Scaffold this active site. Structure first.
Site, PDB file in Angstrom:
ATOM      1  N   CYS A 116     142.054  33.172 -16.292  1.00  0.00           N
ATOM      2  CA  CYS A 116     141.520  34.558 -16.268  1.00  0.00           C
ATOM      3  C   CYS A 116     140.003  34.530 -16.076  1.00  0.00           C
ATOM      4  CB  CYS A 116     141.815  35.302 -17.562  1.00  0.00           C
ATOM      5  SG  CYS A 116     143.578  35.412 -17.927  1.00  0.00           S
ATOM      6  N   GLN A 147     135.833  37.627 -14.482  1.00  0.00           N
ATOM      7  CA  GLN A 147     137.208  37.646 -15.041  1.00  0.00           C
ATOM      8  C   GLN A 147     138.142  38.421 -14.095  1.00  0.00           C
ATOM      9  OE1 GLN A 147     137.090  38.236 -19.188  1.00  0.00           O
ATOM     10  NE2 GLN A 147     139.309  38.591 -19.403  1.00  0.00           N
ATOM     11  N   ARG A 148     139.139  37.719 -13.530  1.00  0.00           N
ATOM     12  CA  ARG A 148     140.112  38.234 -12.525  1.00  0.00           C
ATOM     13  C   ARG A 148     141.012  39.306 -13.158  1.00  0.00           C
ATOM     14  NH1 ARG A 148     145.214  36.533 -13.161  1.00  0.00           N
ATOM     15  NH2 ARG A 148     145.645  34.647 -14.394  1.00  0.00           N
ATOM     16  N   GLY A 187     109.397  59.649 -47.266  1.00  0.00           N
ATOM     17  CA  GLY A 187     109.927  59.097 -48.528  1.00  0.00           C
ATOM     18  C   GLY A 187     108.864  59.073 -49.614  1.00  0.00           C
ATOM     19  N   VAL A 232     112.682  59.490 -54.264  1.00  0.00           N
ATOM     20  CA  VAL A 232     112.644  60.806 -54.978  1.00  0.00           C
ATOM     21  C   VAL A 232     112.378  61.947 -53.981  1.00  0.00           C
ATOM     22  CG1 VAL A 232     111.627  62.151 -56.885  1.00  0.00           C
ATOM     23  CG2 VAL A 232     111.799  59.663 -57.070  1.00  0.00           C
ATOM     24  N   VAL A 233     111.451  61.746 -53.049  1.00  0.00           N
ATOM     25  CA  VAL A 233     111.129  62.751 -51.993  1.00  0.00           C
ATOM     26  C   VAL A 233     112.376  62.935 -51.114  1.00  0.00           C
ATOM     27  CG1 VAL A 233     109.531  63.384 -50.146  1.00  0.00           C
ATOM     28  CG2 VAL A 233     108.699  61.990 -52.044  1.00  0.00           C
ATOM     29  N   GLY A 286     119.219  50.393 -48.857  1.00  0.00           N
ATOM     30  CA  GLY A 286     118.105  49.745 -49.582  1.00  0.00           C
ATOM     31  C   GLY A 286     116.770  50.132 -48.981  1.00  0.00           C
ATOM     32  N   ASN A 330     136.635  37.354 -25.303  1.00  0.00           N
ATOM     33  CA  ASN A 330     136.073  36.800 -24.046  1.00  0.00           C
ATOM     34  C   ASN A 330     134.542  36.991 -24.090  1.00  0.00           C
ATOM     35  OD1 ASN A 330     138.815  38.293 -22.095  1.00  0.00           O
ATOM     36  ND2 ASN A 330     138.932  36.605 -23.543  1.00  0.00           N
ATOM     37  N   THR A 367     116.782  53.976 -39.753  1.00  0.00           N
ATOM     38  CA  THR A 367     116.687  52.594 -39.225  1.00  0.00           C
ATOM     39  C   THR A 367     117.638  51.723 -40.053  1.00  0.00           C
ATOM     40  OG1 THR A 367     114.658  53.070 -38.194  1.00  0.00           O
ATOM     41  CG2 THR A 367     115.055  50.721 -38.659  1.00  0.00           C
ATOM     42  N   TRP A 377     146.969  29.348 -27.343  1.00  0.00           N
ATOM     43  CA  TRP A 377     147.680  28.727 -26.198  1.00  0.00           C
ATOM     44  C   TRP A 377     149.103  28.286 -26.579  1.00  0.00           C
ATOM     45  CZ3 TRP A 377     146.152  28.475 -21.066  1.00  0.00           C
ATOM     46  CH2 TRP A 377     144.797  28.680 -20.765  1.00  0.00           C
ATOM     47  N   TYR A 399     141.335  24.666 -18.036  1.00  0.00           N
ATOM     48  CA  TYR A 399     139.864  24.750 -18.181  1.00  0.00           C
ATOM     49  C   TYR A 399     139.311  23.364 -18.468  1.00  0.00           C
ATOM     50  CZ  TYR A 399     140.352  29.865 -18.510  1.00  0.00           C
ATOM     51  OH  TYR A 399     140.669  31.177 -18.299  1.00  0.00           O
ATOM     52  N   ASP A 423     142.386  42.035 -20.380  1.00  0.00           N
ATOM     53  CA  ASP A 423     143.089  42.816 -21.435  1.00  0.00           C
ATOM     54  C   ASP A 423     142.047  43.490 -22.348  1.00  0.00           C
ATOM     55  OD1 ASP A 423     144.372  43.883 -23.517  1.00  0.00           O
ATOM     56  OD2 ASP A 423     145.348  42.063 -24.190  1.00  0.00           O
ATOM     57  N   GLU A 464     138.639  26.546 -29.493  1.00  0.00           N
ATOM     58  CA  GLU A 464     139.042  26.562 -28.065  1.00  0.00           C
ATOM     59  C   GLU A 464     137.887  26.199 -27.134  1.00  0.00           C
ATOM     60  OE1 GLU A 464     139.332  30.441 -26.313  1.00  0.00           O
ATOM     61  OE2 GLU A 464     140.966  29.710 -24.992  1.00  0.00           O
ATOM     62  N   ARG A 482     103.727  59.899 -54.019  1.00  0.00           N
ATOM     63  CA  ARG A 482     102.502  59.186 -54.446  1.00  0.00           C
ATOM     64  C   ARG A 482     102.781  57.674 -54.420  1.00  0.00           C
ATOM     65  NH1 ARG A 482     101.924  56.248 -58.726  1.00  0.00           N
ATOM     66  NH2 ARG A 482     103.038  57.836 -59.943  1.00  0.00           N
TER      67      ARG A 482
END
Ligand SMILES: NC(=O)C1=CN([C@@H]2O[C@H](COP(=O)(O)OP(=O)(O)OC[C@H]3O[C@@H](n4cnc5c(N)ncnc54)[C@H](OP(=O)(O)O)[C@@H]3O)[C@@H](O)[C@H]2O)C=CC1
Ligand SMILES: NC(=O)C1=CN([C@@H]2O[C@H](COP(=O)(O)OP(=O)(O)OC[C@H]3O[C@@H](n4cnc5c(N)ncnc54)[C@H](OP(=O)(O)O)[C@@H]3O)[C@@H](O)[C@H]2O)C=CC1
Ligand SMILES: CSc1ccccc1N1CCNCC1
Lengths: 534, 523
Positions: free
Chosen positions: A418, A437-438, A144, A147-148, A28, A449, A164, A332, A358, A441, A310, A85
């Protein structure tokens, strides 16, 4: 020698999404003769920077080349800009002509006489190419409009595209030309920023195939490294073609994707208690700028509902698996079974009673755990309250940690956490969060995470009246599962989209008062789902 | 294009401490496999597609295509080499000589009447660059005859027997602009430094600038430090020595750190989240840019391992790390009105061996009460190397308020691979100027200790910094440190006999070949 390389003809555009996501979702350009978005300050500053940047050193080589190709022999330097133009009449009248640049306008209906300003009027492309042989200039930018753009790609007269991606949807009536993966390929993708309440990044397309005695020093100091067979793992070239072909990888999602690569290329082979099979490495750091985006991975679909339920479940101090399972969250569930708890020697623990994990540790650290049905009313340390209080009152404290690793309770837990600890940092009314984090994955676990602790930083920042800044993820044991590999290869070859944004209902002012509906992921554009396994 | 190469060993310290080149017609050390390999690769490398620009340099001064480099030595240094080695494989060997002639030697090899008569062959031969392996006098002769425009110096961080030496390089005449990684070969630390003669798709590089379009620094010094003072630091091309992990975080915090005022009002620059990784299989990372002592921090480490919280134990050995935190005044301000003086509470030692026990006082026997975490991680290293649950955590949340102060060092995590042990230590609050140097040594030791009792080889110590700060009144001192050029790192020799973590004593620890700049008073 095609005309675009000699005369250095480039396109710069900015595209939004219009009322299966692909790179022609960003397409767009304009609405009712103006931009769909009204103003983007950063898109503007990037445009100003790219189109007004010259380097005088390089000019003599270009001035040469241009004389070579065009059979010829040997003010302050400017770039050319070229616009339709319509595009020209769309510009604010105090901003015209575009300052410190050579303004070229394509028009049939209008001759030079129709223009007060210092501009070059042309009625066809062939004429631009004429003028660029007659002028001293650094780079020619085609700005632009539609058209250009269409015309210049049509004639394969563009050598790069400065594209962009404004990561929001608006009403549009002019569209960027569709780009062929064949003719043009992305060689570079930038950081994600926020401007004017949207995210955006900057990507570069390239046209496809179809003091200098201290260079060596580097080779010397690199005499003691590896071979191509002490580059550890076989995992081949071709299998990351789109990944390795990329020149600048500045999107933050390459922070996660580069670790995948490092573990894959350089991982240690290990087999856990399981008899499974991983590639592992030790000790990394990922920094995400929450002020500029929400870093939900884009190289695959992610559902945030469960990991949000969670987080609220922890914040309540709940250890009761049933609660999640009623809300249809199975995170869990395999950790709550008769078998799993029995193999954890937790013979006297109820099904789905995950124990002092936790929830408990954050609200009640060092109270003797009983069962998931006990309210631990004013027993042990309310860490969560404590850290919210230290952020409010002692923001320069170096003791604002939230810690889930209670050594006394590890054996009573379904699994040891973890996510060991969150430490907090406050500067200039902004809040950053380290999370350590020990075990990690990389293929399944880390994506959630990152998001999880990223939302938690927002929540804390909101109820402490601070702005979220950097979420800093420290990986200890960083592993890829051997069966995760095939799918992780597919993902590394996918170029990220601009990150989404996270909106928290502003009315929430206490950490306990957040419900699933207080959270919204706006503008999550993402590659398709991957089953990590098979 | 005339540069020398050399190795120099040892014979208070400055750079020149490294000079020993030869003992009795040969090298003071026997033979170094990695110094020979570097030495080799430096003289085995010629820049393929460059130097037609020195068919237009040397021939515009003095008015095949295999293309090696020259390798200019002397008779004394030609006779020193073993028979089988000579002539220097795949190199144009020259010999500066008087007594020798081309009627005892070949036409592929060369000699020169004198150093002036070297330019006779140089302005006659074909190569890329002139490497001078020379000697005591063939070196001295290219310093007094200011011919040499760079040196490729190996520093052997060991002390041998020597008769010959290197000419002291002139404090101004030349300056180091590059420092390598530190390595181990033949039971010595060595690094590789480069010395320089003082003057006293090119498309995708604009793409870089366009991407760098939103960075703050408009020449406006982001912080108030004058980089014009780190000239030696800023001059350095390649800063690959690991000590530059420390120094580069000093630079960052100074230049980009947030200005914060603590309780006191002291003033600090602070950032958040770093990592430093030291390879303990190649060196002991004991900062060289300022004298560091370690008897204190080793005794603090033994104290922890014994499970002590008795401050007096340390004070009676004149280790005073925990002194200021034992006072009636400090404990009263912590609201510890019932804590005896130098009773530091349930800190490191108590948590490492009795996590979850109820702290009474520093004299109580806690034998068999609370979790013996030290024991448990050593057991896990031993029986479950591939476990991801091997943590030693001193941040017991229930006990924080009882501690003289909460642990600056939160946790150690351990990774085992191929008979090698790596350690992460996450530090919540990092004084970069004073405490962090000791932190790096203290925990590097710990890794070695844990590794030996577990029959493993130290690999990486990994330092994670949380709140990372420079104190404002350290700034001048660190600016001094940032312009000092790191030496090769020492080694740590642990008494090989000690096999319980609990059986170590101060004497079981020797630092070895520790070379360092003068001590600095951070202030
Ligand atoms: N998002 C972005 O990055 C950009 C957006 N815009 C937006 O795009 C829209 C304008 O673009 P779009 O409507 O295509 O209009 P254009 O800017 O492409 O204008 C096209 C007009 O320019 C002239 N023109 C084009 N090609 C030629 C040629 N080969 N020879 C002679 N004249 C030529 C003609 O003018 P005439 O009628 O006089 O013959 C033509 O009618 C606006 O909404 C604007 O805000 C514009 C630029 C960039
Ligand atoms: N660290 C390193 O990288 C290296 C160290 N070495 C070691 O160091 C020593 C090698 O050098 P060092 O013993 O001085 O020997 P040198 O390499 O300095 O040899 C110099 C020889 O060249 C001749 N010579 C000296 N000056 C002049 C002059 N001004 N004009 C003409 N000829 C001259 C003399 O030979 P004559 O008059 O007899 O012809 C002299 O014997 C040995 O111990 C060797 O093992 C060796 C190589 C490398
Ligand atoms: C090139 S037309 C224009 C005129 C006036 C200001 C900005 C623009 N731009 C550049 C930024 N992207 C949208 C188009």
């Amino acid at each position: 020698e095609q005309v675009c390389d000699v005369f250095d003809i480039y396109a710069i555009c900015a595209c939004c999404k219009v009322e299966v996501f692909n790179n022609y979702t960003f397409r767009g350009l304009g609405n009712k003769g103006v931009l769909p978005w009204k103003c983007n300050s950063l898109d503007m500053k990037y445009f100003c920077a790219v189109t007004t940047y010259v380097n005088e050193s390089k000019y003599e080589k270009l001035k040469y080349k241009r004389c070579k190709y065009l059979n010829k022999e040997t003010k302050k330097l400017q770039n050319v800009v070229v616009m339709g133009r319509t595009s020209w009449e769309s510009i604010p009248k105090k901003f015209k002509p575009l300052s410190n640049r050579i303004n070229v306008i394509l028009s049939r209906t209008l001759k030079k006489e129709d223009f007060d300003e210092d501009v070059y009027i042309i009625n066809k492309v062939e004429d631009l190419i004429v003028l660029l042989g007659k002028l001293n200039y650094y780079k020619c930018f085609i700005i632009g409009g539609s058209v250009v753009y269409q015309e210049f790609l049509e004639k394969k007269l563009i050598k790069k595209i400065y594209f962009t991606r404004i990561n929001s949807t608006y009403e549009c009536d002019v569209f960027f030309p569709e780009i062929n993966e064949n003719e043009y390929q992305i060689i570079s993708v930038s950081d994600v920023y926020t401007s004017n309440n949207t995210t955006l990044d900057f990507i570069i397309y390239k046209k496809t195939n179809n003091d200098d005695e201290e260079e060596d020093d580097f080779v010397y100091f690199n005499f003691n490294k590896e071979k191509e067979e002490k580059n550890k793992n076989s995992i081949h070239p071709n299998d990351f073609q789109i990944y390795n072909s990329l020149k600048y990888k500045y999107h933050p999602e390459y922070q996660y994707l580069n670790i995948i690569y490092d573990i894959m290329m350089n991982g240690n082979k290990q087999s856990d208690r399981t008899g499974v099979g991983v590639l592992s490495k030790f000790g990394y750091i990922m920094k995400f700028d929450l002020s500029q985006y929400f870093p939900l991975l884009t190289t695959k679909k992610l559902f945030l509902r469960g990991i949000i339920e969670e987080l609220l479940w922890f914040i309540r101090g709940e250890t009761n698996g049933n609660t999640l399972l009623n809300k249809n969250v199975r995170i869990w569930e395999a950790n709550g079974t008769r078998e799993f708890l029995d193999n954890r020697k937790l013979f006297h623990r109820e099904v789905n009673d995950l124990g002092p994990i936790y929830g408990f540790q954050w609200r009640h650290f060092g109270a003797e755990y009983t069962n998931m049905y006990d309210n631990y009313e004013n027993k042990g340390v309310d860490q969560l309250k404590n850290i919210i209080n230290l952020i409010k009152n002692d923001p320069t404290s170096r003791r604002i940690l939230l810690c889930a690793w209670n050594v006394k309770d590890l054996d009573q837990m379904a699994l040891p956490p973890c996510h060991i600890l969150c430490q907090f940092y406050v500067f200039d009314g902004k809040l950053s969060c380290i999370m350590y984090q020990r075990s990690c994955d990389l293929g399944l676990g880390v994506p959630f995470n990152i998001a999880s602790y990223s939302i938690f930083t927002h929540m804390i920042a909101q109820v402490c009246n601070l702005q979220p800044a950097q979420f800093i993820h420290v990986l200890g044991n960083a592993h890829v599962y051997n069966n995760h590999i095939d799918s992780l290869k597919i993902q590394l070859n996918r170029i990220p989209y601009p990150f989404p944004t996270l909106k928290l209902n502003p009315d929430i002012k206490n950490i306990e008062d957040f419900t699933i509906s207080d959270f919204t992921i706006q503008n999550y554009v993402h590659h398709e789902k991957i089953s990590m396994d098979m």
